[PDB]
Write an enzyme that holds these catalytic residues in place. Sequence first.
Site, PDB file in Angstrom:
ATOM      1  N   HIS A  76       0.858  -1.184   0.000  1.00 26.35           N
ATOM      2  CA  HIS A  76       0.000   0.000   0.000  1.00 26.35           C
ATOM      3  C   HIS A  76       0.891   1.230   0.000  1.00 26.35           C
ATOM      4  CE1 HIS A  76      -1.788  -3.289   2.334  1.00 26.35           C
ATOM      5  NE2 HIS A  76      -2.959  -2.935   1.831  1.00 26.35           N
ATOM      6  N   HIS A  77       0.731   2.075  -1.011  1.00 26.57           N
ATOM      7  CA  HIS A  77       1.503   3.299  -1.159  1.00 26.57           C
ATOM      8  C   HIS A  77       0.532   4.440  -0.891  1.00 26.57           C
ATOM      9  CE1 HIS A  77       4.120   6.399  -2.719  1.00 26.57           C
ATOM     10  NE2 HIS A  77       3.299   6.652  -3.723  1.00 26.57           N
TER      11      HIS A  77
END
Lengths: 136, 144
Positions: free
Chosen positions: A69-70
């Site tokens: 998850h960015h």
Amino acid sequence: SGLVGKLVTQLEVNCDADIFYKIVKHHEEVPHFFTGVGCIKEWNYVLEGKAMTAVEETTHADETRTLTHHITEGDAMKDYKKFDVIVETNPKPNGHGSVVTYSIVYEKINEDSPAPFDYLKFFHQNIVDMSAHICS
Amino acid sequence: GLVGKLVTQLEVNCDADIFYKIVKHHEEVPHFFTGVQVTKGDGLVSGCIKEWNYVLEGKAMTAVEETTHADETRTLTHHITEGDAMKDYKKFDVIVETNPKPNGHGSVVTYSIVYEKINEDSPAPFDYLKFFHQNIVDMSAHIC
């Protein structure tokens, strides 16, 4: 110094690694069942009693059992220039059960920024919560 | 879920070989009992057994800690065997690694707490992780 860092929580879970990876992956995409058959999305959560929101680009890799998850914007970005969360599941060296690793790769906005221990406990608790639905 | 590891990793501006020497020296040296240095049998200190006295979130605390190091990997290990930290944990080892950055200037310091809870109601050592994180910060601010 002290602006770039990584926090990790690693837990042993008595569950096959590929199965636990599938459960984590499904839980985040949606959940009526525990398993299901890039991607930018909204992320809504409650952090120590405070409702919060984010936008995140997510990826997954089935062969390494890795979810990424960015985070691009939202409440987490008040303290961080960069905030990525990585979940990995791998078999224990014997082969009975697995090791689940949550990593937060972060860059603080400035020196008075906190390091994300609150997020680390949050993600740690996610592992505990899911582990609780698995029988020993 | 009794076995786990917590990690804090931080980039600091000091050289890796220098930072390792300072940590190692601080931990292998007024107490209740006199700490002892230990050796493998070659005229070199291999480690130390000593009282670790510390303040954790308002409470004064104490523990028996054995330190070992590995100068080649610039790795230091705290092996805690009794005291306050052992009230929640059957095992509590802290591993400190110091490695140069790719460019060779500055380094990456990693504290890993390898722990085993006594039961499922034991907390994970997030309080200790924040304590060790601040020690990295404090140590580097003192090094020129």
